[PDB]
Write a protein that binds this ligand. Structure first.
Ligand SMILES: Nc1ncnc2c1ncn2[C@@H]1O[C@H](COP(=O)(O)OP(=O)(O)OP(=O)(O)O)[C@@H](O)[C@H]1O
Ligand SMILES: Nc1ncnc2c1ncn2[C@@H]1O[C@H](COP(=O)(O)OP(=O)(O)O)[C@@H](O)[C@H]1O
Ligand SMILES: Nc1ncnc2c1ncn2[C@@H]1O[C@H](COP(=O)(O)OP(=O)(O)O)[C@@H](O)[C@H]1O
Ligand SMILES: Nc1ncnc2c1ncn2[C@@H]1O[C@H](COP(=O)(O)OP(=O)(O)O)[C@@H](O)[C@H]1O
Lengths: 578, 379
């Protein structure tokens, strides 16, 4: 074992092992497990950046320091990796002999403990040099009899793939749950390692830089457990400090240098790491009021709710917001969402719920079960958010979605996340969730009976309460009701449609002047509150696009030029030559 | 579990479909029985039917080790079966019978190991004792008639409280010797009595024992056994709690005062409706007092009131106050008949496959829970 197993206690004596910071209960469990007769081989099971190996080394350090009771103090912890014994590529003549030499020496020294990092290498695996399945089988009897003790190292997902599949370990080993350290501990961990970064990069880190690397990494980097996200910031700040300033050569890394690299590591703007866009948010309501007319309270409800989320009044785990838009048709409930994403400068992820009416929607939104085509997709919903965690997400006409989609949505509204079928998760915290419904368009066309008409409208949102259950409705920030639009709105709608018509005409080299009276008339001609703004697109198409198309194709407008439309005293559209 | 040993024997005594299979789940003691069958033989406590028969445990590890080539796994395995077939009244015990179904110990070894056994079972050359689980049985034996019709299904269940205490006392001296400790009568009963209250997801034979092992081991590791060799119920409480985190603070408090104090604790969180919370307290006491039947619910109460008045909050506080889970369902979502089946886990219209009932699962996972059904007039 002389050139095969690393003595961790010796590295701790040498100084190869950095003192463990915190983790007193994790170490206590490892020793509590090691001191037992059965299930007496601990497994440090976690995720990346938790330090599970650092803890195992940390235990060897405590064994050496004598911070544990003699049962374990002065025992020897050695570590086996995939570098020394896996060199037996000439097979068993090298491998079996070196492998068994360890077992025999370790069997003789019953106060010897091995640490096996990346333990999945052997458990649930066992190849390498073609020696590890039985090498594991040759360790197991000695762990059972108490001749050799073993500390493992794995992750929660690997654990279920390797431990839960082998009863030899179920009776020999015990899981210890390893999670991330505190913020303070992370800073202390950085300070322990800091000099290594300083030495590599020829930089020096301030006290504020190390505190900030941990704090800033938490605020924006969602990739790893605290030690790793903070370290990349320190290592990146260090490196940038020695690369960028060729003409300046600053060595000291301060909070400002952390802010620059965190922004880059975290995939956010160099400004936004500290300074958010206060003004795009202040101006949101007006930019939208200029595009979707008449829905002023709806825009304000949306605008204010977003600002509250952006102002930090809400929960750090939840979506930016969640709204179910409802109202009559042709009122802008989707148009405002589309314009919302543009106004905010945020990519729009759009899912049309009509495409998900079956109970197999999940197989496409989340992903197919393993063994089926499509298991490779992480889910259309989940993948879109993972690649675009900062997004406006639209679920168009949600009342048509199959009810199973609500289990997906209820989870996101409660926890801000959604896992895929491969164990990865979407982060919806920077996603604005808007879903629209036409349950609210149900109304009648029939009037009251009598000489005098009276308003016989039904109660708003009763139809929503009958479609969406309280579980789904109580998780919304709001339900934003859109009203039928008025004739004043129509005049504004006609103006934007005339402009759109002109944009199309500009591409033909044609300038169109529509008189005010022509607009006033069309606005009146096409109005129907029941169908919202739809009809206006239609009346404009019927009265202006028809004549223009005929001229653009066969007549005077074919070459580009100036066309105008006047309203007749007789309410006809009068057109110009060119 | 003497009848289990006898049942395996009655199967070994048959001429066809004469290979007993011990079918269990983790912690029931199915391995212990197989060990017990070998034990009875070594002590001569067997019928002549078995004569002086030797039960051997298939060692897939040893068959694979040092080679990992199909040719060597096979010459050793086939030689094994030949020698086992040759022994008079031979019995092959296969522990982990559900794991050799692949290739013995590993891919690269004998991929046909199950296939080499099938014909001996068919001829009855070696009586074979298997060891599988309830869940694996249908994926190992029912899977292939060459085994389904060669083995008998013997259902192994967990032992009683008293039997586990006897198991602890049987093994206790080993733990006392292993960890330089002694266990009180209360400690051995407590490892059993408390494991069944706080462990929840494992059978008693392993967990009362883990608790004994850990109390001993913990006392050896900490400077306790050096002086305080004795492990009493107090040490057991710390040990079960070590993982469960319950008994060290809640193994016993008062089964009378934690109920009386319910009336007043509810008043600290929910304000007003004092009589409603007292009525619940009274009903709970009557149930605790033993007024009712073993098949009946602890209790059932309809909470009528305005919304937003804490009907839920009282229910939440009852669950917290009583140390139990809260299960919730909204009856307005169970207004239609199909959804009703989803709730029940009725043979038709259930959830998923193993997700069957929503209510059946909720009541199985959390059997001591308080179940809240909202707005039942909409059900
Ligand atoms: N309030 C509005 N102001 C200006 N233009 C509008 C308004 N509503 C709609 N429009 C225009 O009419 C068209 C239809 O709008 P939109 O797609 O948003 O309807 P909707 O809210 O989705 O209702 P539904 O889905 O039931 O049809 C769009 O091209 C849009 O530009
Ligand atoms: N208690 C600790 N003391 C010092 N450093 C720690 C501690 N815990 C974690 N770390 C740091 O976390 C890293 C080790 O964990 P790591 O190897 O990244 O886990 P994983 O293998 O799952 O990715 C090291 O950078 C280590 O310094
Ligand atoms: N009937 C029994 N009598 C005594 N000890 C038992 C009994 N059954 C199980 N045990 C012990 O409880 C632990 C788990 O039993 P085990 O045979 O491994 O079942 P499983 O592997 O299915 O969980 C073991 O330590 C075992 O020795
Ligand atoms: N009796 C009560 N004591 C304290 N808070 C209450 C009480 N009743 C209602 N509330 C509060 O009113 C809100 C709704 O109460 P809750 O029971 O959770 O939902 P529901 O309206 O369905 O009963 C909550 O903020 C709750 O705290």
């Amino acid at each position: 074992m002389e050139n095969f197993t690393t003595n961790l206690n010796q590295l701790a004596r040498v100084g190869g092992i950095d003192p463990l910071i915190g983790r007193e209960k994790e170490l206590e469990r490892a020793i509590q497990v090691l001191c037992r007769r059965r299930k007496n081989n601990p497994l440090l099971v976690g995720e990346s950046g938790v330090g599970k190996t650092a803890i195992a080394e940390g235990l060897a350090w405590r064994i050496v320091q004598g911070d544990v009771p003699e049962v374990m103090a002065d025992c020897t912890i050695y570590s086996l990796d995939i570098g020394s014994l896996l060199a037996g590529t000439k097979y068993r003549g090298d491998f079996e002999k070196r492998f068994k030499a360890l077992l025999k020496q370790l069997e003789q020294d019953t106060n010897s403990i091995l640490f096996i990092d990346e333990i999945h290498t052997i458990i649930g695996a066992g190849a390498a040099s073609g020696g590890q399945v039985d090498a594991a089988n040759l360790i197991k009897p000695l762990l059972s009899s108490g001749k050799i003790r073993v500390i493992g190292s794995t992750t929660y997902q690997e654990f279920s793939n390797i431990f839960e599949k082998d009863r030899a370990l179920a009776r020999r080993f015990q899981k210890i749950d390893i999670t991330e350290p505190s913020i303070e501990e992370t800073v202390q961990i950085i300070n322990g390692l800091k000099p290594k970064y300083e030495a590599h990069h020829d930089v020096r880190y301030t006290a504020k830089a190390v505190r900030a690397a941990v704090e800033l990494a938490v605020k924006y980097i969602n990739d790893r457990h605290l030690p790793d996200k903070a370290i990349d910031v320190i290592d990146e700040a260090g490196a940038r400090a020695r690369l960028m300033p060729v003409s300046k050569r600053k060595k000291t890394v301060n909070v400002a240098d952390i802010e620059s690299v965190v922004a880059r590591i975290a995939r956010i703007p160099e400004k936004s790491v500290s300074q958010s866009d206060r003004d795009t948010l202040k101006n949101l309501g007006d930019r939208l009021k200029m595009l979707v007319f008449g829905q002023d309270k709806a825009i304000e409800a949306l605008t204010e709710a977003i600002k509250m989320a952006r102002a930090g009044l809400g929960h750090e785990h939840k979506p930016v917001g969640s709204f179910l838009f409802a109202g009559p048709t042709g009122v802008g409930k989707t148009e405002v969402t589309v314009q919302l994403s543009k106004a905010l400068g945020i990519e729009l992820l759009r899912f049309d719920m009509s495409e998900y009416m079956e109970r197999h929607t999940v197989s496409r939104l989340i992903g197919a079960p393993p063994g089926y085509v499509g298991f490779d997709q992480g889910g259309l919903l989940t993948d879109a958010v993972i690649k675009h965690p900062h997004a406006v997400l639209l679920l168009d006409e949600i009342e048509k979605a199959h009810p199973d989609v609500f289990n997906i949505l209820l989870q996101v509204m409660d926890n801000g996340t959604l896992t895929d079928n491969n164990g990865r998760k979407a982060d919806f915290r920077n996603v604005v969730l808007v879903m629209t419904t036409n349950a609210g368009v149900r109304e009648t066309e029939r009037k009251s009976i009598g000489l005098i008409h009276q308003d016989n409208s039904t109660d708003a949102m009763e139809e929503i309460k009958k479609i969406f259950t309280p579980e789904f409705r109580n998780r919304l920030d709001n339900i934003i009701w859109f009203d039928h639009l008025s004739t004043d709105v129509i005049h504004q709608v006609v103006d934007k449609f005339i402009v759109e018509l002109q944009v199309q005409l500009d591409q033909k080299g044609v300038s169109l002047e529509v008189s005010q009276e022509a607009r006033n008339w069309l606005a009146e001609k096409g109005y129907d509150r029941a169908m919202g703004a739809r009809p206006m697109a239609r009346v404009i198409q019927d009265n202006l696009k028809k004549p223009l198309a005929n001229e653009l194709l066969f007549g005077s407008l074919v070459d580009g030029g100036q066309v105008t439309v006047a309203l007749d005293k007789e309410k006809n559209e009068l057109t110009y030559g060119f």
